[PDB]
Symmetry: D3
Subunit: 288 residues, 6 copies
Amino acid sequence: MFIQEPKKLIDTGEIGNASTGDILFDGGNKINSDFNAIYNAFGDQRKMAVANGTGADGQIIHATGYYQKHSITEYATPVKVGTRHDIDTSTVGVKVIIERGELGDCVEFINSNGSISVTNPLTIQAIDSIKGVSGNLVVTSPYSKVTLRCISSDNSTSVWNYSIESMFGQKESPAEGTWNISTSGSVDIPLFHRTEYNMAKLLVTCQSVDGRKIKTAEINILVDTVNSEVISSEYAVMRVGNETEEDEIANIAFSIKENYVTATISSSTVGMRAAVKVIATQKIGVAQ
Amino acid sequence: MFIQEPKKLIDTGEIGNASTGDILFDGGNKINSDFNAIYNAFGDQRKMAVANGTGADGQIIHATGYYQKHSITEYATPVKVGTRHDIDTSTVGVKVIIERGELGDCVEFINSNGSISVTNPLTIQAIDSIKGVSGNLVVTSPYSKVTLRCISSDNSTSVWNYSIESMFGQKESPAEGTWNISTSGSVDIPLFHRTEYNMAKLLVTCQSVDGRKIKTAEINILVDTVNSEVISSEYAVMRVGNETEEDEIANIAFSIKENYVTATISSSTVGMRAAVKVIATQKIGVAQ
Amino acid sequence: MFIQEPKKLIDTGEIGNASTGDILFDGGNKINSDFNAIYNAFGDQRKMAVANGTGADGQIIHATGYYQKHSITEYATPVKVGTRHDIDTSTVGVKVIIERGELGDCVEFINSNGSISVTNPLTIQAIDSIKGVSGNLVVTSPYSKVTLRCISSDNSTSVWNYSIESMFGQKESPAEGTWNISTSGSVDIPLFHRTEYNMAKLLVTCQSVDGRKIKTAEINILVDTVNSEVISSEYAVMRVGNETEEDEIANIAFSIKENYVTATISSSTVGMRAAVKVIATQKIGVAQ
Amino acid sequence: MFIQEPKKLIDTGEIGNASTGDILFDGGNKINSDFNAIYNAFGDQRKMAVANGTGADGQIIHATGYYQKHSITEYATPVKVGTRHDIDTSTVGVKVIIERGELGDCVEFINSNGSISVTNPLTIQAIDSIKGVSGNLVVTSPYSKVTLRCISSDNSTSVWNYSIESMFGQKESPAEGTWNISTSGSVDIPLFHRTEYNMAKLLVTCQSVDGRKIKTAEINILVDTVNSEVISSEYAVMRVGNETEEDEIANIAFSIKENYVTATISSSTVGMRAAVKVIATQKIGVAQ
Amino acid sequence: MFIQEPKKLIDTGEIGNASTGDILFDGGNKINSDFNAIYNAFGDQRKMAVANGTGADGQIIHATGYYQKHSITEYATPVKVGTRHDIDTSTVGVKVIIERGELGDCVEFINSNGSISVTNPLTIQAIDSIKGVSGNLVVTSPYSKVTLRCISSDNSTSVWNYSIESMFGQKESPAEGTWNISTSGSVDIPLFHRTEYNMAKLLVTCQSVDGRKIKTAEINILVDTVNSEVISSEYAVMRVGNETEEDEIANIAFSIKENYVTATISSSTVGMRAAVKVIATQKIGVAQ
Amino acid sequence: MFIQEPKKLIDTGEIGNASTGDILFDGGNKINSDFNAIYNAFGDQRKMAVANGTGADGQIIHATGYYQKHSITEYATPVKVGTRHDIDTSTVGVKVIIERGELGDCVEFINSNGSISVTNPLTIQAIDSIKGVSGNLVVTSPYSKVTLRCISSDNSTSVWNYSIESMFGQKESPAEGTWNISTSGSVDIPLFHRTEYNMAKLLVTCQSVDGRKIKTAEINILVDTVNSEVISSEYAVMRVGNETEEDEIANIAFSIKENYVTATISSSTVGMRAAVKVIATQKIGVAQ
């Protein structure tokens, strides 16, 4: 037979305490904190002032990363490591201070509007110091890219070093490598199509398999497109195993072959190697 | 390609709005309200002063139902229809008032401690009135059961009627039915085992299938266990189609047969029916 | 090192599959089904037509239980076992049919408005049959209470029996028990306060501890409040071991003692017991 | 600027700690415990052996309440207060023991299959004792209803009393009340329709508004439907303020008026009240 | 006493509306949107076509970032700012159009398979225009890295500028800084280990603390590893405070010291400073 | 009328299975996996050993990206593509092996502490091979930046190429573009403020609108700040359409105008264009 148990009543005072509500609230907040962290590291932070960076014009993850636009008053306090800044010194130079760092910490600056100049510079103070710099780093190169990295921290020593580069320009090299001079005693090395550059600068170093013979030379070449030729000026020639003070070890000539500015390297010595590298170029663009 | 959608954040500003939290609290309290209503209708209400009728000595559902034990002060205000009361007038009479009812409404009382008396009565006032009673119903019968029922409501016409009966006592009837007087002209009707009662009272009405002959009589019988016999006293005899004022219509005798006090009904008239009903009994018990 | 695991996304394709959503709907409906079953068994079913038995005038649990008030059309189909009915035959007699039952099944009826009569009867048909009744049970007693109980089911043998009693009336017994006739040869048995009844009927059976002497008598008594006395009429006297046909075995007298109608039982025979039982009373009330 | 907060991760190490999971399991079981307690108090407990009282033939709430059918072995241990039992002693008598009770506690029994007899009795032992009974209560009345109630508990004083009555039978009273004898000196009191009963027994007590004149009588009446008359037998007549030992105080006659067996009460004494109460009836039914 | 409240029922129509289900679904989708945004910015987008970038070969976050491979038809519509592209012009030149930008917006291109050439170029049209370019930017440098940045937006003026660099090559500088010429009038500056380069180009500028004396010269040096010597060729010499047209101001010599090609700078003038920077180098590698 | 449904009970065995608990646990873990992936790609991985990269000093998203510091034993197994490394060869050279890659895959190395040298080099083995390299790539340039990119995969061929650059240094170019020589036959081109550099190297190429006349020359200039002048040395002059071997085609002069080192280019020929590019500079800093 059924022997009932006394009356039981649902404790309405236990509809909380680590139950959904508590977990979803604590979870969501954590999730939001993390995403805000990520989005603000790769997106425009100025959007946070609107729906917390949401909406049709809200924050997005830039695969290229993002450089923040901050105000003067905001730079009154040390910047955190890992941040990126797009500096604007249009109305006045700005100073940025970087908090003490640890080995590998980095901070990068960009100058999209090209406001950086000698009168309105970008002054950087990296907590403690910057190597090779007395005091603050003063940047006056417009449209520049400055990267600061901490090269020593341990404890009481926080030292940084920096790099400064142009954001824009044609810096590419059309050719760099090493080629063998075939048994025929000559090798053609295509440098670039006749229409890519008007002028190029290259370094050529030829050495025998045993290093007894070697020559190096710097060459500036001019592309004469109208006559389909290439003028050259070889200088700073240096040789080591030259049998005669007239013995070249290796001759370098230029011309256009198959519409490609081409370097022709030949040598008497057998088993000669030749390193060719284009370290500069100039292309006449459009004025302005 | 994949065109991302701007940043989306979790609206923690919601969550607790008519959700698992609200439906369990609005649901729980609802489940605790109903059950409480059921357990207090079929259980001791006095226990509500503890763990709200819970615990080891908590409230339970009495299949027999339950009769609440209230205090004088509590009965100071009209009682709700459908309630049950176990009255205690040991210290003083108690007055109970019943709220206006509607057809069928019911309130029942009992007196387990038998305190009801003429000095400590149970006074009942049924809003408006009680039929056959001018004013309040005054109950003075100890160990009684009082049932009040609304026999009329409509508008103001809220009238009640009542019944009062003993909670205890031997009230059973060992036999009641109708038997045919067999063609042989005689029928034996066992009433009860010889040890069940010392005396019984019965009503016997014999009638012909046509209805022209009929006799009724009231008989008191005494069980003589020692001599295995039964004395009888037949009176208030009434006959209708009796062809003569002599022996007539049907004879009723008693004796013990197979250890059962038995009634033997015989008649000359063919096709006679005999209704026998025991309406009272007395059994000698143990003094006190 | 930390070797990440590929991207993982939340399978929203799930969530609503047998979870908090499904268990609350499959649970709630279950809780509303049961309670409804309980409140409609102990409350007015007519209220279901409102807020499903809710609200201020909603359904409540009647400790006294409840007797449903249905319509003619509703009784057109067999009623379920265990139900209660408050019959209304004021406009016309009503026929109620009870579905086949099993041993113990029960259906109860009452007649609060007292409409039951011979012209507007309560006809009851218990699937299969009712003992001692050929066909339907025809109830014509106004303000009655009818109880039907299945006394046999097995296979088709589904038979019922019934009881019919008055809802109202004074049915209590002011005294019933057994008393010893003290060695002094006399015993006083208080029956009731002088103001409780005008007349009473009692059964008295005196028997010796051995069982050789025994007497029973039926006595009607009238309370004469004005003269503080009690008239009595003793009849249907029966004796067994009476040594003589003269005064014998036990005498029964009445009077008022301490304001209580009292029975005084005396006997010459030592070691006599006396069972006294009041089987009827009449109290003059207020006309109408 | 936006200064992010370090990475935050979701503490899955929690979740299932007193949350939706725990409150539904601790709540559900609670809801299933209570309902089970209610359905088993008002429904067949034998069904618990199936789908825990569920399914098509599951447990239901009986408005009439329910009386459990247990086995001998189950009754080997004391029963809880408030329970109901449908006894079966067809194969052998059964002994039921009731745990110690407190004032008002109740246990009820019925005998639907009418197996109770002197050879296969229902023996009841109420922890401590039953008033007027030395030892166990031995019930031998078939088709009876036994009610046990604790009339005293306190400390060890845990005493019970009981009532026993027939489950079936016609026990109703067709009339009970008080009527004024109109100034005309006569009053008609309709008792019942001529077809309702063959014989009735009534008590009649007439008393003057002052109380100096009073008469009571017991009358048995026989309905002669064929001749549309009613025979009566008035006896045990008792009078108090009767100015003469001749015809006196009030006369009682019977007849059929408007098809209703009717009592006509008349008296010379002005200002007389008449209480009439039918205490027994007999109706010839169908044999067997 | 307990005064129950009417029946209450759990509203099953409130198992939704901002409850778990709604929040978890809306939350998860947002979370997924964000992660897809991040992963697609730093991972292969071509994987989205498979299990939405999940699985054992699903998307991962590249610390180095990622450059997407898109098809010709996909470039038919403007590319979003912040995206990265790995161009493939193997079967035909491809044109990319960049949506209008805002100050700082950036888009970067890479050419991993070296397909870029004059016949199958990378044509870029940056909505509105590119500074120093008439119309589209036509890139013909294979294995190149092109970066476009918006240098002016405001409103109706969206101007971009670009940088083009080689993805590969030895561009490092083995030494750059400023050294003091000790009072001894000479300073050794280690340039690089004898085995790192065969040829180097440096710029040397010496200036007195007061800037009255200063000399600048460009020097190409050849490392003769066999004889453990270094040949040099100094030219473009310029001086300002030279006392005589024979006075050098500062002499620069080279040799191998401690196995490091070393610059030895000496001067008569006291307090002379010397800036040394290696602006080019050549190392003979392996042919092909 | 209400026709109840059998008992229903809440299945406590369904408080799980894809319900909150399961989804929140599976979701959270996925979320954590993703964020750990992101944070470890842009943050210090050494922090994972502490509270899983959480806390006040927990991991953060570096907008500049991050280069991991791993131990020798960790480099015993192939590095995944997309990773970044800050190499430390202070106590011994380290070897890194890169897993097979696919077109575009990249791995980048940095040397923040400048430990890289010939005795403690950075040896890199890119599964399969590196173009122009026999076997492993041996890096001996301190404070270097090495980038490896896969330029060919398909199937059985996984070839990589690399770039090596200095992490630090002044590499910026103060001017690069093309200017028209006005009809006046002369044009001034500001190069940089007098205080920015002591020496600069530029390439100048002038060509007529029809390309019949053209001249190219390399020029080193020295800024004499004390006398506010600029000394120049023009060489490697090459011309094509020169009418006479004395006809210059274009003359280039230098001076300080408005405090800016300035190039003045003039020519007889009408419609002459002039490309000016500064390919190197030297600024005397502070010794040490």
